[PDB]
Design a protein around this ligand. Structure first.
Ligand SMILES: Nc1ccn([C@H]2C[C@H](O)[C@@H](COP(=O)(O)O)O2)c(=O)n1
Ligand SMILES: Nc1ccn([C@H]2C[C@H](O)[C@@H](COP(=O)(O)O)O2)c(=O)n1
Lengths: 317, 318
């Protein structure tokens, strides 16, 4: 049990690095590995890694979480924030097991919007043990040479003593890279759903079949091992805000618009979501080679400024 | 970490009974509960509960595991061994979330035989992290007033250092009743799959979202807490031919379309391990169809099974 994700993350990284249960090479990928490993977080809103050597990218973090909320499988959205993700796209335009959005809101087993059913299940029966969003699908194993099979099995939500608890079940998790964004996204969905339900935040449990560090990540992982609060999302239904943020996300990503510090403050959005749009504008400055905006940076929560300053030190450091 | 399931079971039962995190009533069923709980078994073949006060039913245990291997959703098969299971059948003929058989071998998502795909996945890539049997289905929460929603999410198998390890992921588990037969069946499937693959047995990991004791079981649960012969190993190799023959006898004995004396059972053309399983079904047929109990049958069984039968049906085998 850990207070914040960062303590859990580093503890697990050290466990696998120094006392791996196995060294093997699934699909030819040499790894250190522990089996059946997990942790409990007391404060899931504190979901970020702030160790500078890790260079956690808070823009990618929100982009991935919002890509899920959009229900999209499209590669162009997410590859803008992480170009290497295209290696898991077989068709050059969509992702499969990596795209949790359609698994959540239109799962290929029946076209089901599972988030809606979870919300209704917990409204009719607050004590329910059934409020599960399934991610994995039985047909992913049916064809050989699938380059992108979902590694998350399911996400569960439970209301306990007025608080929404979350549990993520995964068959496998890259403990150095994937875990950072997976825990971010799952606790983001937990918090988003809690706000929608009008509840506080309970614990988050992460449970993983194979948790591993790729040998190709060892040097960076060693660097990380040798080495301010995350803001709370506003109460209530955040779907209207998410829709407006996604409109700005696409306009900024394609460089079809840009937002000054004053334009960002004038957005018709809660402050929390204004900061997310500001992160997309900062990212647009990087990607499309526009002037880094000192005023934008100064108005962000300190957690976000630090992430930006360490990730792109030439722009925001 | 525990050596055998019985140690894990009693430890967990004590945890939930004396130190529950929550007390609540999902779907109106008052319960003691802990969230996010599990254990590891170093020797999953030792999968049985022998505490006499528990009255663990080894006939049901094998029946449920073999019901799964048969791929069946039929209620008549399984309610014969556990009459109360009929409470979860909406149509009086089939089970839904309780019937893991069809989930394993012809899952509602595409009719996929996932056991074959897992075996093929692990044959092409022994180190695979993808060898998962999905149980739960997204449409189950869309059924209004669904009385039988799968509580197992998935089962995973991994070949690690020549041993087949298994992991059961559940969203919820009844720690008094369901855990006994779920861990039995899952470790049974693990061993069965390990024999087929020519591997030894590794650890079994059980991970559960809501682990709970229903208030209506509290009295029985403390009797168990207030209170060995070893479980036999399944034979090496592909056990599907034996399973097919055992399922033929299971159906004839359950419908009283056949019966076998102790000497007839000993002479069956089956490995000893499976002959004992057929003998358990013949003994159960003697109970449920009111035939003469065969004490000679009882004497030839492994002691673990003898104890189970003697405690469960003392008038017949006690
Ligand atoms: N959201 C994601 C997507 C992928 N992975 C990592 C863990 C998997 O082990 C690996 C995919 O390889 P495989 O399918 O062989 O497990 O990617 C992860 O940790 N989180
Ligand atoms: N193979 C099974 C089937 C059912 N259950 C128990 C756990 C569930 O919590 C409960 C079903 O109720 P619910 O759907 O509300 O969780 O039955 C179990 O432990 N193992």
């Amino acid at each position: 049990t850990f207070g914040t994700f960062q303590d859990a993350y580093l503890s697990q990284l050290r466990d696998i690095y120094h006392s791996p249960e196995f060294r093997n090479a699934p699909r030819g990928q040499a790894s250190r590995e522990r089996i059946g490993a997990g942790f409990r977080l007391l404060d899931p809103v504190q979901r970020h890694i702030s160790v500078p050597a890790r260079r956690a990218n808070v823009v990618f973090n929100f982009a991935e979480a919002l890509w899920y909320l959009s229900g999209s499988d499209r590669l162009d959205f997410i590859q803008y924030y992480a170009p290497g993700i295209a290696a898991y796209s077989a068709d050059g335009r969509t992702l499969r097991g990596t795209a949790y959005g359609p698994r959540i809101f239109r799962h290929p087993a029946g076209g089901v919007n599972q988030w809606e059913n979870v919300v209704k299940t917990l409204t009719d029966d607050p004590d329910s043990k059934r409020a599960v969003i399934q991610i994995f699908d039985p047909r992913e194993l049916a064809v050989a040479d699938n380059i992108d099979v979902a590694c998350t099995l399911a996400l569960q939500f439970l209301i306990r003593d007025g608080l929404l608890c979350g549990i993520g079940y995964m068959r496998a998790n890259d403990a150095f890279r994937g875990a950072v964004s997976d825990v971010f996204s799952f606790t983001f969905l937990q918090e988003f759903t809690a706000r929608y339900l009008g509840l506080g935040i309970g614990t988050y449990h992460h449970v993983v079949g194979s948790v591993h560090i790729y040998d190709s990540d060892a040097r960076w992982a060693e660097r990380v091992l040798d080495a301010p609060g995350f803001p709370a999302m506003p109460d209530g239904d955040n779907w209207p805000h998410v829709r407006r943020v996604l409109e700005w996300e696409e306009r900024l990503r394609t460089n079809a618009a840009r937002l000054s510090a004053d334009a960002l403050d004038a957005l018709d959005l809660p402050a929390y979501w204004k900061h997310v749009v500001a992160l997309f504008e900062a990212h647009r400055q990087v990607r499309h080679e526009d002037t880094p905006d000192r005023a934008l940076l100064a108005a962000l929560p300190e957690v976000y400024r630090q992430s930006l300053a360490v990730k792109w030190p030439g722009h925001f450091g």
